[PDB]
Design an enzyme around this catalytic site. Sequence first.
Site, PDB file in Angstrom:
ATOM      1  N   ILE A  10      84.830  45.090  -6.543  1.00 30.07           N
ATOM      2  CA  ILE A  10      83.510  45.688  -6.441  1.00 30.07           C
ATOM      3  C   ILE A  10      83.312  46.271  -5.052  1.00 30.07           C
ATOM      4  CG2 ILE A  10      81.077  45.365  -6.812  1.00 30.07           C
ATOM      5  CD1 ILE A  10      81.596  42.884  -8.354  1.00 30.07           C
ATOM      6  N   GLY A  11      84.199  45.906  -4.134  1.00 31.97           N
ATOM      7  CA  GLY A  11      84.099  46.423  -2.784  1.00 31.97           C
ATOM      8  C   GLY A  11      84.506  45.459  -1.688  1.00 31.97           C
ATOM      9  N   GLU A  12      84.281  45.882  -0.448  1.00 32.02           N
ATOM     10  CA  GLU A  12      84.607  45.075   0.715  1.00 32.02           C
ATOM     11  C   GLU A  12      83.341  44.885   1.541  1.00 32.02           C
ATOM     12  OE1 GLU A  12      89.063  47.173   1.040  1.00 32.02           O
ATOM     13  OE2 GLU A  12      87.857  46.813   2.841  1.00 32.02           O
ATOM     14  N   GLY A  13      82.852  43.649   1.583  1.00 25.16           N
ATOM     15  CA  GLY A  13      81.645  43.341   2.330  1.00 25.16           C
ATOM     16  C   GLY A  13      81.869  43.167   3.819  1.00 25.16           C
ATOM     17  N   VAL A  18      84.819  41.485  -2.236  1.00 26.46           N
ATOM     18  CA  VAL A  18      83.989  41.020  -3.340  1.00 26.46           C
ATOM     19  C   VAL A  18      84.639  41.439  -4.644  1.00 26.46           C
ATOM     20  CG1 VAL A  18      81.732  41.099  -4.440  1.00 26.46           C
ATOM     21  CG2 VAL A  18      81.906  41.259  -1.957  1.00 26.46           C
ATOM     22  N   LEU A  79      75.448  42.183 -11.151  1.00 23.32           N
ATOM     23  CA  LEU A  79      74.651  43.351 -11.567  1.00 23.32           C
ATOM     24  C   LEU A  79      75.590  44.558 -11.488  1.00 23.32           C
ATOM     25  CD1 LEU A  79      72.302  41.379 -10.253  1.00 23.32           C
ATOM     26  CD2 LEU A  79      70.863  43.376 -10.739  1.00 23.32           C
ATOM     27  N   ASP A 123      69.867  42.432   7.458  1.00 20.04           N
ATOM     28  CA  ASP A 123      70.749  43.586   7.286  1.00 20.04           C
ATOM     29  C   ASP A 123      70.562  44.324   5.952  1.00 20.04           C
ATOM     30  OD1 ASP A 123      72.777  45.409   8.098  1.00 20.04           O
ATOM     31  OD2 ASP A 123      74.336  44.211   7.111  1.00 20.04           O
ATOM     32  N   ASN A 128      73.111  46.798  -0.547  1.00 23.27           N
ATOM     33  CA  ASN A 128      72.839  45.454  -1.042  1.00 23.27           C
ATOM     34  C   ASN A 128      71.564  45.297  -1.862  1.00 23.27           C
ATOM     35  OD1 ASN A 128      70.949  45.167   1.111  1.00 23.27           O
ATOM     36  ND2 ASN A 128      72.603  44.391   2.434  1.00 23.27           N
ATOM     37  N   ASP A 141      72.391  39.023  -0.613  1.00 20.40           N
ATOM     38  CA  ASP A 141      72.777  38.485   0.694  1.00 20.40           C
ATOM     39  C   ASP A 141      71.674  37.999   1.643  1.00 20.40           C
ATOM     40  OD1 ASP A 141      75.317  39.022  -0.269  1.00 20.40           O
ATOM     41  OD2 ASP A 141      75.588  40.853   0.909  1.00 20.40           O
TER      42      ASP A 141
HETATM   43  N1  LIG Z   1      76.304  40.737  -7.123  1.00 21.04           N
HETATM   44  C1  LIG Z   1      76.940  41.910  -7.471  1.00 21.04           C
HETATM   45  O1  LIG Z   1      77.040  42.190  -8.647  1.00 21.04           O
HETATM   46  C2  LIG Z   1      77.437  42.748  -6.475  1.00 21.04           C
HETATM   47  C3  LIG Z   1      77.919  42.165  -5.258  1.00 21.04           C
HETATM   48  C4  LIG Z   1      78.428  42.977  -4.206  1.00 21.04           C
HETATM   49  C5  LIG Z   1      78.465  44.389  -4.347  1.00 21.04           C
HETATM   50  C6  LIG Z   1      77.993  44.992  -5.542  1.00 21.04           C
HETATM   51  C7  LIG Z   1      77.474  44.188  -6.627  1.00 21.04           C
HETATM   52  N2  LIG Z   1      77.038  44.731  -7.730  1.00 21.04           N
HETATM   53  C8  LIG Z   1      76.831  46.199  -7.925  1.00 21.04           C
HETATM   54  C9  LIG Z   1      78.103  46.885  -8.361  1.00 21.04           C
HETATM   55  C10 LIG Z   1      78.546  48.057  -7.699  1.00 21.04           C
HETATM   56  C11 LIG Z   1      79.744  48.701  -8.106  1.00 21.04           C
HETATM   57  C12 LIG Z   1      80.464  48.134  -9.179  1.00 21.04           C
HETATM   58  N3  LIG Z   1      80.061  46.997  -9.841  1.00 21.04           N
HETATM   59  C13 LIG Z   1      78.892  46.393  -9.425  1.00 21.04           C
END
Ligand SMILES: NC(=O)c1ccccc1NCc1cccnc1
Length: 294
Positions: A10-13, A18, A79, A123, A128, A141
């Site tokens: 889903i990415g790099e925090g 993540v 989400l 932040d 987010n 977060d």
């Molecule tokens: N809690 C989460 O679900 C979440 C956590 C960190 C970053 C994005 C997130 N969701 C949105 C998302 C963005 C791109 C692809 N799939 C989901």
Amino acid sequence: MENFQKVEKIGEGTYGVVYKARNKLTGEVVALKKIRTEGVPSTAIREISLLKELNHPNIVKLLDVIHTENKLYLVFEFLHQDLKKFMDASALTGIPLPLIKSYLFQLLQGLAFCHSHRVLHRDLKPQNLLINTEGAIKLADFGLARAFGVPVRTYTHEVVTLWYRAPEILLGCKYYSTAVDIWSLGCIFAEMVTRRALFPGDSEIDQLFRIFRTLGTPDEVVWPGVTSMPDYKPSFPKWARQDFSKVVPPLDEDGRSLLSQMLHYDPNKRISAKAALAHPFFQDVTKPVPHLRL
Ligand SMILES: NC(=O)c1ccccc1NCc1cccnc1
């Protein structure tokens, strides 16, 4: 950690990567974040654990905190999309005003809840703020900043955004207040309206001067105590304030009035989340459904 099957990145925090993952036992789909270490501070474990009790409809739920092998994992509800992507996808036509208002209203409810419990985010940014198909938006977060810290680069040397940072933080104030979150949300509100970031600074000083160029260089009249701040310099150029009608056109006066109160320089004069919920801008608020193409 073979209790989860990685579905995708889903990415790099700011702290770690993540992943979207499924609990092999429950079938539950969640967001798994691996946190940065040599012994893992015990101070941070108790702080983070307390957040498991911070539950509200507009706050991304923290399901579990897993500590192991110099590694910390946070399990969050999942989400499908974030506001940064939604804004890009709505760039041509813009997000309709009723949806912008619904989103701002829900985010202020979430801030009011956290702030009443003495928890700050520190932040906030479009990345987010998460959304679903039902028209809900949630803050992700909250409280992690205080639990740890806020480096300049992510674990992958990525550059952390300064676009939403309040002026008191940029001027070196050591103690943040709930007001820093209201400032960040005001910047996001302006961005949803105009479809362009309000203050896109690319360095700490550029960020500060972009704010000064628009709202005017602060002084003792509008911000008592500002000239005594840690990083304040008498040599700062003195720019005159611009009119809000020029800052977020074509937003109506109810909207401009609320935005101006969220962007007051003095943290003490800046409007609170609870007070903002009562502003006349929300008299006709509703809950529209966004069109999401997942
Ligand atoms: N809690 C989460 O679900 C979440 C956590 C960190 C970053 C994005 C997130 N969701 C949105 C998302 C963005 C791109 C692809 N799939 C989901």
